[PDB]
Amino acid sequence: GQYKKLWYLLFAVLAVCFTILGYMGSEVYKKAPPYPEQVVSASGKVLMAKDDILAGQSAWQTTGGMEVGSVLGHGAYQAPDWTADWLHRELSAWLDLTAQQTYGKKFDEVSPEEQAVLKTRLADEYRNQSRIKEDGSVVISDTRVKAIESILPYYHGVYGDDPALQTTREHFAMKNNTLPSQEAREKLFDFFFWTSWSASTNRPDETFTYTNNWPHEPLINNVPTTENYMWSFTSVVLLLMGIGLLMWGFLTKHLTPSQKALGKYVFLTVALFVVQVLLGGLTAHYTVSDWFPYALTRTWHIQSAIFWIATGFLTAGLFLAPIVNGGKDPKFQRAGVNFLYIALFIVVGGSYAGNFFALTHILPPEFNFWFGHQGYEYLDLGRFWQLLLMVGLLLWLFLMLRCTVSAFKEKGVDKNLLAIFVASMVGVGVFYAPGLFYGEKSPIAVMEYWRWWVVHLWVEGFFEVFATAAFAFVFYNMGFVRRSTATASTLAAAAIFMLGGVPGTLHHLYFSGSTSASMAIGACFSALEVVPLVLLGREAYEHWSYQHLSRWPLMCFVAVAFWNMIGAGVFGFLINPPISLFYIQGLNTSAVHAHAALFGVYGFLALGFVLLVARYLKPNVQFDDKLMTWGFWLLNGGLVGMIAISLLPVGVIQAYASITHGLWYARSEEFLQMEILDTLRWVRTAADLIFIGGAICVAIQATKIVFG
Ligand code: HEM
Ligand code: HEM
Ligand SMILES: [Ca+2]
Numbered sequence: 070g071q072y073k074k075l076w077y078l079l080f081a082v083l084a085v086c087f088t089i090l091g092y093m094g095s096e097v098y099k100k101a102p103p104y105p106e107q108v109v110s111a112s113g114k115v116l117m118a119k120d121d122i123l124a125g126q127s128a129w130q131t132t133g134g135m136e137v138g139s140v141l142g143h144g145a146y147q148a149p150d151w152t153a154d155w156l157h158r159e160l161s162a163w164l165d166l167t168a169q170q171t172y173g174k175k176f177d178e179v180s181p182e183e184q185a186v187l188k189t190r191l192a193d194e195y196r197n198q199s200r201i202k203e204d205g206s207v208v209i210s211d212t213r214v215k216a217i218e219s220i221l222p223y224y225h226g227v228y229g230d231d232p233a234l235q236t237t238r239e240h241f242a243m244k245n246n247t248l249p250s251q252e253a254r255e256k257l258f259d260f261f262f263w264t265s266w267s268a269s270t271n272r273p274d275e276t277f278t279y280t281n282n283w284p285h286e287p288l289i290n291n292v293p294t295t296e297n298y299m300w301s302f303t304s305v306v307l308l309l310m311g312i313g314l315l316m317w318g319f320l321t322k323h324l325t326p327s328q329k330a331l332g333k334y335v336f337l338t339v340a341l342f343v344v345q346v347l348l349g350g351l352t353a354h355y356t357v358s359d360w361f362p363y364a365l366t367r368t369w370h371i372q373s374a375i376f377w378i379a380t381g382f383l384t385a386g387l388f389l390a391p392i393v394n395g396g397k398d399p400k401f402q403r404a405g406v407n408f409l410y411i412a413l414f415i416v417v418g419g420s421y422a423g424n425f426f427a428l429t430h431i432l433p434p435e436f437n438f439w440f441g442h443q444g445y446e447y448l449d450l451g452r453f454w455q456l457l458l459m460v461g462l463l464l465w466l467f468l469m470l471r472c473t474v475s476a477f478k479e480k481g482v483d484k485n486l487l488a489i490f491v492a493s494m495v496g497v498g499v500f501y502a503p504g505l506f507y508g509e510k511s512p513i514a515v516m517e518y519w520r521w522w523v524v525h526l527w528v529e530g531f532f533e534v535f536a537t538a539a540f541a542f543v544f545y546n547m548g549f550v551r552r553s554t555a556t557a558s559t560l561a562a563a564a565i566f567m568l569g570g571v572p573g574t575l576h577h578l579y580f581s582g583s584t585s586a587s588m589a590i591g592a593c594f595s596a597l598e599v600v601p602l603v604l605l606g607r608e609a610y611e612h613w614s615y616q617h618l619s620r621w622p623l624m625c626f627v628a629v630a631f632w633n634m635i636g637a638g639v640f641g642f643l644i645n646p647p648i649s650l651f652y653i654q655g656l657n658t659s660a661v662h663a664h665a666a667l668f669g670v671y672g673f674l675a676l677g678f679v680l681l682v683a684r685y686l687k688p689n690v691q692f693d694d695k696l697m698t699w700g701f702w703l704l705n706g707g708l709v710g711m712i713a714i715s716l717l718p719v720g721v722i723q724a725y726a727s728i729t730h731g732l733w734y735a736r737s738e739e740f741l742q743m744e745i746l747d748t749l750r751w752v753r754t755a756a757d758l759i760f761i762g763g764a765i766c767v768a769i770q771a772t773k774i775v776f777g
């Protein structure tokens with residue numbers, strides 16, 4: 070049409086940004102910490118082969134993987150980071166040993182001058198004994214092997230049942246015998262070791278580790294890289310030079326069968342939401358019987374979110390589809406809508422059940438990757454059920470894309486608003502696919518890549534787009550926006566959302582085995598996602614303090630903007646710069662970001678859809694002004710309560726000790742089980758309840774709208 074300029078602008082951004090994201094992926098595959106063929110102990114005693122690790126990886130998924138504690142910065146925050154906790158002990162044990170044989174004292178009786186003399190040896194041994202090329206085999210010294218075999222007892226007693234370390238496990242919210250088979254434990258530790266190896270050893274090319282010196286370990290000088298600083302100030306420039314430009318100031322002056330089906334869709338979303346916040350409190354109480362332990366209550370807490378939020382978005386789109394098609398279903402829509410609904414119930418019910426058996430070792434650890442627990446945060450489904458939800462999303466696009474070719478028919482009307490909105494829904498449908506391309510014993514580095522195409526590009530990138538696209542469609546069809554307004558703004562917002570979104574992804578991969586390039590791309594581009602925030606919060610305040618148009622959605626789609634500013638913005642870009650994330654990755658800083666960002670934005674959006682559909686599916690069914698009120702505030706103040714008086718304080722405290730002593734310490738057992746940390750953990754269950762309250766209210770309100 071006449072918008073060809075903006076269309077080319079969009080095609081430009083998509084071409085540019087997808088290449089960066091593609092390239093930085095090829096380099097993930099190439100220059101990722103390889104699994105060694107064998108770990109030989111100078112003498113000969115091979116400690117492990119290739120599959121000694123790859124098994125311990127498979128064995129890690131068995132426990133719930135990232136659902137117990139973090140590994141390489143990614144996971145859960147009650148247990149320690151295993152890659153950090155491993156490296157630290159394996160170093161300390163190495164020292165005590167060499168301080169003995171050289172001076173005959175336990176390093177603490179050895180004088181400052183000598184301590185620092187030992188650590189020089191330590192760093193050279195550890196950091197400069199890199200994977201021998203052309204025959205990828207690694208060679209260790211004997212004082213190290215003795216070091217490992219003196220810490221393995223503790224790890225067997227924590228992942229097991231050794232009665233000594235009972236409260237240890239309890240402090241880590243771990244059900245006694247998290248891995249009952251000492252068969253597998255032996256292998257899990259070969260994985261735990263190799264991770265710690267990838268994080269403590271220089272690349273073939275550099276004087277930093279495969280993990281860009283992650284984590285922060287003073288005893289081998291795992292200090293921020295050099296390129297770290299170069300780019301983590303670049304980005305802070307860009308951001309500020311961003312805000313300066315955008316803001317240079319004020320107070321500106323501008324029913325058919327299928328549709329009727331969506332009632333149970335609405336119910337599902339509120340149902341599942343309240344299923345989730347419960348499981349949330351449950352898994353929150355574990356941080357202060359274990360058929361369903363911490364590892365499980367958390368897994369569902371993560372899983373229900375994606376579902377109920379995604380489902381709310383699907384549901385919305387399904388309602389609009391007939392409305393697009395004049396006002397009539399083309400064929401057996403209602404039929405496909407029922408199929409889809411079954412599907413979604415088979416994925417949700419299916420997975421949850423599968424999860425139960427894997428984390429009790431009832432499922433055979435040969436079906437573990439497909440029907441058990443993937444061990445990978447946000448994708449702990451099982452390759453089968455994940456494909457089933459994939460098929461489901463495909464069907465949703467099928468049903469979706471049908472109603473649209475009927476409106477691509479008339480000769481008169483401008484088919485541009487449609488055009489972009491059509492791409493939008495594809496975005497939702499097709500783009501869960503990336504996270505398919507990784508196997509059981511796929512390199513951790515690679516899985517880490519694709520996972521974030523989903524947990525980042527999908528739920529942030531394409532949902533962002535769909536929200537605005539559907540909004541524009543409605544906003545124009547309601548008649549509060551002209552054609553050449555709603556049509557135009559969608560095409561720009563699509564360009565803006567995607568500019569920071571696409572390459573930004575890489576803010577996840579700064580340390581999980583990438584080239585220092587990751588810090589460059591991620592840091593720069595993710596700084597541009599500032600203009601969407603400012604723009605929204607700007608307009609959202611402008612279109613607010615006014616009387617012109619009048620349980621009103623502005624509430625919903627203002628709160629949205631607000632959290633998109635506190636959570637995606639403040640807490641998001643506080644943690645975005647490589648220099649920062651180098652310390653506060655895997656700390657309660659991320660917990661803040663997540664809660665405020667996921668619920669605060671996409672939670673409300675999702676809830677404001679299923680609510681809107683219910684207001685249309687059962688009209689003249691009168692809302693409750695007191696419920697909606699109570700809810701809208703307990704939820705808001707609730708999130709405010711969670712982040713303020715618990716998560717952030719701890720995050721802060723963690724952040725500090727991470728920086729002063731090392732990360733291993735901010736994750737260490739004694740540090741966690743502390744005076745005010747344990748207390749700040751308690752104060753949470755105050756605002757936890759408040760939150761569940763508003764959650765109940767919104768399910769309750771929603772129910773009595775769809776049912777009667
Ligand atoms: C009272 C309500 C809630 C409570 C008590 C709660 C509690 C928790 C707990 C215990 C964790 C795990 C922390 C750890 O690993 O140690 C967590 C993480 C998480 N929660 Fe919630 N949660 C609540 C509401 C929500 C909501 C509304 C959402 C959004 C749908 C959500 C999404 C998440 C996500 C995505 C994570 C993973 C965070 C990360 O790995 O950094 N939670 N929450
Ligand atoms: C807009 C909606 C957003 C949502 C729903 C969201 C969601 C999340 C979630 C759930 C995590 C934790 C993942 C995990 O446990 O492994 C996370 C991490 C992160 N997000 Fe966001 N995010 C959003 C926007 C942003 C923005 C705008 C930035 C840019 C500053 C950003 C930067 C980050 C960074 C740097 C992390 C790293 C945390 C870590 O790996 O420990 N996010 N995000
Ligand atoms: Ca996490």
Ligand SMILES: [Fe+3]
Binds near residue numbers: 573576577
């Ligand atoms: Fe991200």
Ligand SMILES: [Zn+2]
Binds near residue numbers: 236240742
């Ligand atoms: Zn205790």
Ligand SMILES: [Zn+2]
Binds near residue numbers: 529533570601
């Ligand atoms: Zn965004």
Ligand SMILES: [Zn+2]
Binds near residue numbers: 323608611612
């Ligand atoms: Zn305006």
